[PDB]
């Protein structure tokens, strides 16, 4: 397939070829043009707070070690020995000043440097240039309020610029709340779906909630529970949708601070969020204070998603075109009482974790949609994302980005997929920029 | 009888649990425990989830399944949360899950799922301090088949506490499972172990 | 004790079968049943198929394994044949299968197959109407290994009736299995569950 | 591989390259040139007799919904939602007036039309062109005496013409017997063989019976039971073999109406068949009446096979080059007594179903032959199908098609494989026709 | 009761072993055997390997697991070594393996492995000639999970001899396993069956 | 990938691209340029000593039957029927005068000839040219002191010449000891590693022993047990390393005749080896007699490895880029007492067999090194093999080949990989020779 010319995503993001969820050659191409190019979630400060603390993470199909340095910064390195290529670290988290390879015993520091080699003087003499044999380092590592992302491409925009217009929406919760903590360890489960299937679902799919999750809504008695079985369409003005230049996007369901949490936590959360919002009104203004306590379903392009307020945080780790490893963490506000942090974390996993009754509702949706992209008669078929097209705006006085002022629509899909096309058809960031110079115009056509 | 200083791979928790069963062995308790667990598994296999709650599960239950993060055997400094709760349910939370299973808009339950449970290695001992508390240990293989060609097999050891409740019926008051596979390869863990 | 109006996922058949075991429990019958089934499985695992027919299988046997078509949980109108018979054998038909296994021109049996059966969850109850009819329920994992690297694992619940026959030996008069996997991923079902 | 020029099947069908049973690129190419082009078995009237009845079926690797319309016709559609591509129907059979997607709740009728969309007016307004969003329809659906076949290619010949000379042989049983019923549900088992391995075995392989099935013949005591261990070659004139332009073919074993059925059913069947034959002599003539009660082992190209009289009906559903999903139904004559229909159906599954003792004899044959096509030293090797070559005729006064007037031979393999070459090397039906203009001459060379 | 001339697929060895269990059945011995094996498997599952050696393994033990070469069912002339020993260990050799498991430089044991054993089909009979020798037969499924996504499942029948040793404790004096899979698909057989 | 020009192995064998352990296209290319071209281990005389004895073996991914002929020679044939391609023989060893196919009953002799066909006269008449339908024969089959190797390429050098300079090192044990026996059957286990990972480890990796096998050394109390945990570097002069033109190579650890055997066998072995060495001094000289009782870790290119003295003999059978089937036999000296042969064989399997406690130490090393070759950021990375470079010699007066006069180094890796590059970039043996005309100069650069 010639990805310079192949139209995988139609103009304005209106449709995508079904093969994108099944084609293994494309998957290999995405390793290059999506995963090796863009910003990928690694960890949170709360998980590696002290010098020497480390975790392992996936970046695409690669595995990296993410380590807190003595100077307080974080560096990340491929989890591959520079000698004969064995995986260096076999655990998920720990604290160490270095990593020793179990094959021939080469020892690397927490800073990636090759620090020792067994019997170096007798064997290599002075012939080994250890300064050129440090672990392969992740070029870029940056923080968004404690959330640590990595990028293999030194040419990428800074993480903050990459978030584009989505940053404005995240800031009330990520910054103005006093900050968030990620509660680990994550749940880890493999699903037989393409990574884009859950990524697109979280970035912009409010339409599915009432039907897909009819049983979870009815059974849990959570705040969004009227929609069960599409019994009721939310009011006009119940939220909105937004997307951005570099592909990140989100839905906003106004005031839904208790999110998917069952009736057992609703009163305490609605009280906590509303009390904080009262204090934030004076600091960031009423609109932003209300965004803080509004449920945001977001994907940070390409493969990191979250439900704020519900506190769900996901990484859709790609394995092959129809396999993804799902990592699920809980997000909590640092100033919540400890007992509340514990109950919220358990509730996140109860609903969206490995045995998450909500997440289980989506299994068949994601898996079959993805697997059908392999089927002969469906490869060249068009997946539709036209809901709300011709009613989106850009440059609004109150809400930034390309915005659909409706709770349910496909605005965020269109922006995710215009960003995806531009990358898949580009050889570097400069070309992505050239292909994106009229991004918002493309997305607001017919309005 | 285990000294964990010598038996270096054994956890304090595991050494403690062993001790309960090696001492006072009562063949009759082992039989009662086998019946309880076989009946429980039959109810679950036929998807009689309401019956399971009514006959097998105590009002004060804690039903807990953890996933422990992989850490170095020699780790000593990193002290953050060691595990997450796949399940950590009280009775009401179990009831919610049961309602979710039974709702006719649970689309994933049509066509009907097929479950087959294999319970082995049953051990039973009365608690030393609470004469009414029965400790039961058992291992389960759970086979789940759906949608023609999906097959998921789960394997786990279960550490239970059972106590007589309403009508003198022994009911589950605590189940603890430390799930042995870190990354699940079964699509989800949406089964009652 | 199950009400299928409330326990919406439970079939009438399954509710009926439960009832047989929850009432009159006899620990001695459970033990006899465990022995019978363990002996049966040993004979089958060593491929003593003639011995199995002679010692374990009654002349009036019905040996039945079904595959049920996947239908909507809410289906109510479509009334055509719900299942097919993978096995639905009388004694003579079982004998034919046994002769087929033993024929030295059964090329697929060289090199010799290897079978390992795991029988669990045994329950036993005498029939209410026929004092000589024993109902036994058990679950089986059957592992079949052949030709170096072929490995097939089967999982099923078995609903049996056993009755004393020649010499007072209890023999199988009915086995019913509703095979849980719709599309078999084991090459064939050519095993005696 | 250039399939225009690659000789996969030699002149006259005399041999085939072993790689055809193992090559994954070829398998992908067959999806296009075999499965998307030719007629494929779907279901029988007896399985969807009433309005609203439906079943799912595979066509190649695609899954379709096959539905009885209110007007009595049958239409088939891809089992894929037109919105985001989820599989629409998760059951095998049922009765419904429509299908609702569990992802976003779109509802399609039994006629494929998009009938409803949740909250259409509030969400899409009048922007959604539902008339262009009906399920993707199978272009051609036709019946051969109640047996329903589908074809994705509107250019295909009518099903009756596609059957070519094979139709003449099937008609006594399919038409003149009063008609057949298919008894469902089928057995379903996955084997590690290429779909062509069982297809070729059933289309023309009488040679294997005595040796492969030595144990089943000996143990069952069926009518063909003399051949056990090749103890005896059937008489001269015990049958014949035939093949046709579009690849379908069959063996004929004269008078073997009880087929593979064990001695328990032989007397009743031989009585029933012979009584009907007596009535048919006056209607279709002695030769055709005898064909009615003769055992036909047939493959309807590409992947549907049957044993008439035995009542075995198979679909070799392709998964990949070395994986096939075998569906096994029983065929019974509608006017047989019910109890006999039941016993015959059970006997079909006893012999050829998931635990079929006969079918198990063929497992290793098909699996290893197929897997050996992947092995390096065997890819370019030649599988032989020359038995009977130079003794076949065409245009016989009594028996139509390319015919070998012997019970055991490879005539039917040669015709299956000449049809297969012609398709694999052609871009459309017109090209297949051009490549097949001297089909029978090619098959009868040296005579 | 088996005649191997008629039951053509049955080996002389297997026919001999059957005979031990069909004759004198003692329900009490079956229970003692079940306890012994369940306790053994618990110790092994928690990786209390020193405890296992001390409590379950006799000083004169032979612990043997074979892999038999695939030969024609009709083979009669080729007489070379029929099998290899995956394990053929005395007590000292088992101790070496246990030390290897416990060494903190056994890099493959970090992070800690997870084991779950399922023991079924227990049969027990006293030896006819040596009144102190107990024959126990059982089947095991052993599940091994490591490094996130590695899962290996082992299946075997075990033919054991157990004898009372120090302190009157019954200890394993011989274990024999004929491993059913010729080519292992579990990375290694580094587990105690 | 263009294998004519792609630099997979750098000049002097100094490094290799990590992708070589993961790339499936390369694996397919190795079937052609490595496995179909070079000499591969089949069996030993001791396993098929009498007429009619046979075994099956893999050659690459192909399976062959290896049979003792009536005249005492050995011939090998593909284990594939010439009719429709079924695998002919389903057992591992036996004695027979021929092989009959279970599909259609064709019978082939132990000499590969097609000897019978069921009903030949009635079916084929005289049309079947049986003389052209014998099993596909392995072109070359040769013995090295009872060890039987096969090669599909008639152009290959004789086995003795192919062994090159390595032969001189093997001869004391293989020839002058009175001869070796291979004790079967082998253990067989599948590992998730590329075949080159264990091949390179055995050909030249002494460096890993002290660290990888720290626990096995400590626990077993074998002769090499000082090195546990790299507690001690062997003396200067404790051994050497060598490599050869056609890729075979080995390490020599002087005097280590008890090898990996646990203390239980050390005294008896050291006594036996030393007694034989005393007799050999007068026959082959002191240096060669000492080589006889020195531990050689060797790979016979491409995929057969051994540890003499320890008595481990391995075949790394390739399945795909990250799958290998490991066969483990024991080697024993024919004149050892029987009881000692039995105990040694059990000890070989105890340490290096399916439950080998030593071999288990290497599992993670080989598997992760191989699997990391698939990971995007590692494909183009360089695996290092520079230890000892610039200190190797050629043409030494005492020790032949390219030799590093040190026990621990990477000399043998460099020679294995220069041979591998030359093959992968060559279309035939003549081209390999042209690419290898300055093999030793390339390997000794900078000295
Ligand atoms: C995915 C996308 C949007 C959502 C909105 C509310 C609750 C759950 C959701 C899951
Ligand atoms: C396949 C092909 C031909 C046959 C003829 C008779 C019986 C079974 C058969 C199976
Ligand atoms: C591999 C390579 C070299 C060795 C040397 C001594 C012992 C074991 C070895 C294994
Ligand atoms: S592979 Fe890491 S030290 Fe050699
Ligand atoms: S995928 Fe079917 S309604 Fe959206
Ligand atoms: S495939 Fe071997 S005789 Fe036909
Ligand atoms: Fe959802
Ligand atoms: Fe057949
Ligand atoms: Fe090693």
Give the domain extent around B193: 1-193
What three-state secondary structure class fits C5? coil
Closest-CA residue, ligand 4 atom 1, reads: A84
CA distance A112 to E68: 49
Q: Exposed e or buried b for every residue in A26-40, given b needs 16+ CB within 10 A?
A: bbeebbebbbbbbbb
- Say yes or no: CB of residue F102 within 6 Å of ligand 6: no
Identify whether the C-beta of residue C165 lies closer than 8 Å to the C-beta of residue C172: no
Q: Is F81 annotated as a binding residue?
A: yes
Which uninterrupted H or E stretch holds E185? none
CA distance D31 to D424: 10
Q: Is F101 annotated as a binding residue?
A: yes
Tell me how far the alpha carbon of residue F202 lies from the centroid of ligand 3, in angstroms.
6
* Pairing of β D74-78 and β D62-68: antiparallel
Residues in a beta bridge with A327: A188, A315
Among residues F319, F330, F336, which one has the least CA distance to residue F352?
F330
CA distance F80 to D70: 55
CATH of residue B62 = 3.10.450.50
Tell me how far the alpha carbon of residue B7 lies from the centroid of ligand 5, in angstroms.
56
Tokens of D320: 């990949």
What count of other Cβ atoms lies within 10 Å of the Cβ of residue D443?
Answer: 25
Q: Which atom of ligand 2 is nearest to the CA of D260?
A: 7
Tokens of F112: 């590969």
Touching chains B and F? (3+ Cβ pairs < 8 A): no
Identify whether the C-beta of residue F13 lies closer than 8 Å to the C-beta of residue F415: yes
Block residue for tokens 């080729």: E78
CA distance B30 to B139: 14
Among residues C159, C155, C167, which one has the least CA distance to residue C125?
C159
CA distance A26 to A370: 13
Across the interface, whether the CB atoms of B139 and E117 are under 8 A apart is answered yes
What count of other Cβ atoms lies within 10 Å of the Cβ of residue F307?
Answer: 25
What three-state secondary structure class fits B189? coil
Identify whether the C-beta of residue B161 lies closer than 8 Å to the C-beta of residue B124: no
F383 at A interface, C-beta within 8 A: yes
Tell me how far the alpha carbon of residue D297 lies from the centroid of ligand 2, in angstroms.
6
Identify whether the C-beta of residue D105 lies closer than 8 Å to the C-beta of residue A228: no
Which uninterrupted H or E stretch holds B36? helix B27-45
Residue B110 C-alpha from the chain's centroid: 26
> What's chain B's length in residues?
193
* Domains contained in chain B, number: 1
Identify the burial level of B4 via C-beta atoms within 10 angstroms of its C-beta, where 0-12 means exposed, 13-18 middle and 19 or more buried: middle
Edge to edge, the sheet with strand D140-144 lists D40-44, D147-151, D140-144
Identify whether the C-beta of residue F76 lies closer than 8 Å to the C-beta of residue F65: yes
Tokens of F248: 């075979």
For the four alpha carbons of D328, D329, D332 and D338, in that order, the dihedral sign comes to positive
Q: How far is CA C63 from CA C87, C143, C172, in A?
A: 7, 20, 9
Identify whether the C-beta of residue F354 lies closer than 8 Å to the C-beta of residue E83: no
CA distance A216 to C83: 32
**Helix, strand, coil in percent for chain D, rounding step 5:** 35, 25, 40
Which member of D161, D208, D286, D364 is catalytic?
D208
Q: Give residues with Cβ within 8 angstroms of A329, minimum separation 6.
A: A44, A182, A183, A184, A186, A313, A314, A348
What count of other Cβ atoms lies within 10 Å of the Cβ of residue A189?
Answer: 26
CA distance B140 to B161: 16
Among residues F190, F299, F288, F188, which one has the least CA distance to residue F241?
F299
Tokens of B30: 């082992």
Instruction: Specify the DSSP class assigned to residue D76.
Output: E
SS (H, E, C) C83-150: EEEEEEECHHHHHHHHHHHHCCCCHHHCCCCEEEEEEEEEEEEECCCCCCEEEEEEEEEEEEEECCCE
* Pairing of β E57-68 and β E170-178: parallel
Which chains are within 8 Å of C by 3+ CB pairs? B, D, E, F
Selecting from F91, F102, F188 the residue whose C-beta is nearest the C-beta of C111 gives F91
Following CA atoms C109, C110, C112, C115 in sequence, which dihedral angle do they give, to the nearest 10 degrees?
A: -40
* Pairing of β B170-178 and β B57-68: parallel
Tell me which CATH code domain D36-164 carries.
Answer: 2.102.10.10
Ligand minimally distant from the alpha carbon of residue D118:
5
CA distance F104 to F84: 9
Query: DSSP per residue over A48-90, as a string?
Result: S-STTEEEEEEETTEEEEEEE-TTS-EEEEESB-TTT--BS--
Resolution of this entry, Å: 1.7
CA distance E64 to E177: 6
How would CATH label the architecture of A1-35+165-447?
Answer: Alpha-Beta Complex (3.90)
The distance of E83 to chain F (nearest Cα, Å) reads 6
Residue F352 C-alpha from the chain's centroid: 15
Identify whether the C-beta of residue A79 lies closer than 8 Å to the C-beta of residue A88: yes
B88 at A interface, C-beta within 8 A: yes
- Say yes or no: CB of residue D106 within 6 Å of ligand 5: yes
Instruction: Specify the DSSP class assigned to residue E56.
Output: H
Q: Exposed e or buried b for every residue in B60-99, given b needs 16+ CB within 10 A?
A: ebbbbbbbbbbbbeeeeebebeeebbbbbbeeebbbbbbb
Across the interface, whether the CB atoms of E149 and B182 are under 8 A apart is answered yes
Across the interface, whether the CB atoms of F374 and A61 are under 8 A apart is answered yes
CA distance D64 to D43: 11
E59 at B interface, C-beta within 8 A: no
Identify whether the C-beta of residue F256 lies closer than 8 Å to the C-beta of residue F240: no
B150 at D interface, C-beta within 8 A: no
Domain boundaries, chain F: 1-35+165-447, 36-164
Q: Exposed e or buried b for every residue in A314-325, given b needs 16+ CB within 10 A?
A: bbbbbbebbbbb
Instruction: Specify the DSSP class assigned to residue F251.
Output: E
CA distance A164 to A39: 13
CA distance E181 to E175: 18
* Pairing of β C57-68 and β C170-178: parallel
- Backbone phi, then psi, for A411, in 5-degree steps? -50, -45
Query: DSSP per residue over C10-72, as a string?
Result: --HHHHHHHHHHHSS--HHHHHHHHHHHHHHHHHHHTT-HHHHHHHHEEEEEEEEEEEEPPB-
Identify whether the C-beta of residue D114 lies closer than 8 Å to the C-beta of residue D52: no
CA distance C13 to F82: 54
Identify whether the C-beta of residue C73 lies closer than 8 Å to the C-beta of residue B104: yes
CA distance E157 to E175: 10
């Amino acid at each position: 397939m010639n990805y310079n010319n192949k139209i995988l995503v139609s103009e304005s993001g209106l449709s995508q070829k079904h093969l994108i969820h099944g084609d293994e050659e494309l998957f290999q191409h995405e390793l290059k043009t999506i995963f090796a190019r863009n910003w990928l979630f690694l960890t949170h400060d709360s998980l590696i707070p002290a010098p020497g603390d480390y975790v392992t993470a996936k970046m695409g199909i690669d595995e990296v070690i993410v380590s807190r340095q003595n100077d307080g910064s974080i560096r990340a390195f491929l989890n591959v020995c520079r000698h004969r290529g064995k995986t260096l670290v076999s655990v998920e988290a720990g604290n160490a000043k270095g990593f020793v390879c179990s094959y021939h015993g080469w020892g690397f520091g927490s800073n990636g440097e090759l620090q020792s080699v067994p019997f170096e003087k007798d064997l290599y003499g002075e012939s080994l240039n250890k300064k050129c044999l440090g672990l392969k380092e992740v070029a870029r590592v940056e923080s968004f309020h404690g959330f640590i992302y990595g990028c293999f491409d030194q040419e990428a925009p800074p993480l903050m610029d990459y978030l584009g217009d989505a940053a404005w929406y995240l800031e009330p919760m990520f910054k103005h709340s006093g900050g968030l903590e990620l509660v680990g360890p994550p749940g880890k489960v493999v699903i037989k779906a393409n990574w884009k299937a859950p990524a697109e679902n979280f970035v912009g799919d409010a339409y599915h909630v009432g039907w897909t999750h009819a049983s979870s809504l009815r059974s849990g008695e959570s705040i969004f529970s009227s929609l069960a079985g599409n019994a009721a369409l939310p009011p006009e003005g119940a939220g909105l949708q937004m997307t951005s230049k570099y592909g990140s996007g989100m839905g906003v369901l106004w005031d839904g601070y208790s999110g998917v949490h069952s009736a057992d936590l609703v009163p305490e959360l609605m009280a906590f969020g509303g009390a904080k919002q009262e204090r934030l009104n004076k600091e960031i203004g009423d609109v932003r204070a209300r965004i803080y306590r509004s449920h945001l379903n977001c994907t940070v392009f390409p493969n990191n998603s979250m439900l704020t307020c519900s506190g769900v945080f996901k990484v859709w780790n790609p394995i092959d075109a129809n396999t993804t490893e799902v990592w699920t963490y809980a997000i909590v506000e640092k100033d919540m009482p400890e007992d509340l942090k514990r109950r919220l974390a358990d509730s996140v996993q109860r609903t969206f974790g490995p045995a998450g009754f909500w997440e289980s509702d989506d299994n068949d949706n994601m898996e079959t949609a993805s697997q059908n992209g392999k089927k002969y008669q469906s490869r060249d078929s068009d997946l539709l994302s036209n809901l709300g097209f011709g009613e989106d705006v850009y440059g609004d006085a109150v809400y930034p980005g390309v915005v659909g002022k409706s709770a349910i629509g496909e605005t965020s899909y269109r922006g995710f997929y215009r960003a995806y096309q531009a990358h898949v058809s580009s050889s570097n960031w400069a070309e992505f920029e050239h292909a994106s110079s009229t991004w918002h115009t493309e997305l607001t056509k017919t309005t | 009888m285990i000294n964990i200083q010598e038996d270096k791979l054994v956890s304090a928790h595991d050494a403690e649990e062993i001790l309960r069963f090696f001492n006072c062995h009562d063949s009759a308790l082992q039989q009662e425990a086998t019946t309880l667990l076989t009946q429980e598994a039959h109810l679950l296999d036929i998807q009689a989830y309401r019956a399971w709650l009514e006959h097998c599960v105590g009002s004060e239950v804690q039903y807990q399944v953890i996933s422990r993060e992989l850490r170095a055997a020699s780790e000593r400094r990193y002290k953050l949360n060691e595990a997450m709760n796949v399940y950590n349910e009280n009775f009401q939370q179990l009831k919610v899950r049961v309602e979710h299973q039974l709702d006719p808009q649970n689309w994933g339950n049509s066509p009907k799922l097929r479950f087959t449970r294999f319970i082995t290695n049953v051990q039973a001992a009365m608690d030393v301090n609470d004469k009414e508390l029965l400790h039961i240990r058992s291992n389960v293989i759970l086979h789940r088949a759906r949608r023609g060609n999906q097959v998921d097999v789960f394997y786990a050891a279960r550490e239970d506490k059972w106590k007589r409740g309403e009508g003198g019926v022994r009911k589950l008051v605590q189940r603890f499972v430390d799930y042995p596979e870190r990354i699940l390869q079964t699509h989800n863990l949406m089964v009652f172990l």
